[PDB]
Design a protein around this ligand. Structure first.
Ligand SMILES: [Cl-]
Ligand SMILES: [Cl-]
Ligand SMILES: [Cl-]
Ligand SMILES: [Cl-]
Ligand SMILES: [Mg+2]
Ligand SMILES: [Mg+2]
Lengths: 201, 201
């Protein structure tokens, strides 16, 4: 029942994205529900910023829908993905392998697009929700420890969101940014805004 | 876990909307997941159109979050709400009563805002999903038969989306627009766009 809801919602969002043109001026935020949840053009006060987030999405789900994005040759793509693969038990190594597939596809199809790999955000089990995600809070840092070298190896930028969202004493997401331990409150998007607005300018 | 997920997601979206300014140039799409699911500014190619949809939302959930919208005195508000009240067993009469509360609040707080009441969309049980909604498909027309007179009585516009989405033979939503009987595929948002762009123009 729950997997059918993601699958149908993914098809809803993906088929809408196929109908919306991407141009060389565009700045794309690409990812899962943490990307889906924002009004990106309003947050940055920039009409060229576009939401390509899909709640529930995974690395290969992003990979499979790159074409209606990269064929428009967008100016920038900000990628945040992986935590739903964590909740499926997928290893950090395999997740990094699949992000590297996304990086190589974007570079091959739209070499002038500037690509930004955003650190997987921390999670927190304190609210007792999304246990498949939050019980694996330690995998976030395993991914990010591998994700930053991948960025420099592929010649793309790495944005460290994690270190601002995390509680350094616990390795988990600071509750001020979330009400379920996984997704962001408005205050969380303001922090994200302050970190990445220089890259969007 | 289902009600907690809506409740936390509502707080996520609502607290984000409290951080995003609304101005007198804005055109607001206000409603539940059928409103939430779209990229409205891209669909109409109009930077002034803004998404205030929240998946799972109900009439009083919309009412309770009017302040961060109407305080900016927006140019237009397009309201689509009620199907999640239907799925709770709420009568059409009670739903109309609550929509009329929303109308009066908007008219009181922002008298120059043009308000458009959109027909509740049909649903379809053919995919066997969201049975709390789809088993009550006959309630949609009961609401809409009362909603258009309310628009007249309150001096606001009524937009008949339902006629374009429904199968006249069955009273249910044409499957070409949906993959679950409730929410819209990209083709569904294109139909909505074609109906409503004149009002957004
Ligand atoms: Cl949960
Ligand atoms: Cl989970
Ligand atoms: Cl269902
Ligand atoms: Cl249901
Ligand atoms: Mg909190
Ligand atoms: Mg269909």
């Amino acid at each position: 029942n729950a997997e059918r809801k993601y699958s149908t919602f993914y098809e809803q969002r993906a088929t809408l994205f196929e109908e919306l043109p991407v141009t060389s001026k565009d700045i794309i935020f690409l990812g899962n529900s943490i990307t889906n949840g924002c009004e990106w053009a309003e947050l940055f006060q920039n009409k060229n910023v576009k939401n390509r987030g899909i709640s529930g999405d995974i690395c290969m789900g992003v990979y499979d829908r790159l074409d209606p994005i990269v064929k428009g040759k967008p100016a920038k793509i900000f990628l945040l993905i992986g935590i739903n693969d964590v909740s499926r038990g997928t290893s950090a190594d395999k997740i990094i392998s699949e992000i590297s597939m996304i990086v190589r596809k974007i570079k091959q199809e739209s070499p002038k697009t500037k690509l930004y790999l955003q650190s997987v955000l921390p999670v927190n089990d304190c609210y007792g929700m999304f246990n498949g995600h939050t019980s694996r809070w330690q995998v976030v840092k395993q991914i990010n420890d591998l994700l930053e070298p991948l960025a420099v190896k592929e010649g793309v930028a790495y944005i460290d969101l994690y270190s601002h969202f995390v509680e350094k004493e616990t390795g988990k997401m600071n509750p001020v940014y979330t009400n379920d331990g996984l997704h962001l409150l408005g205050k969380g998007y303001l922090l994200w805004r302050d970190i990445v607005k220089p890259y969007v300018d």
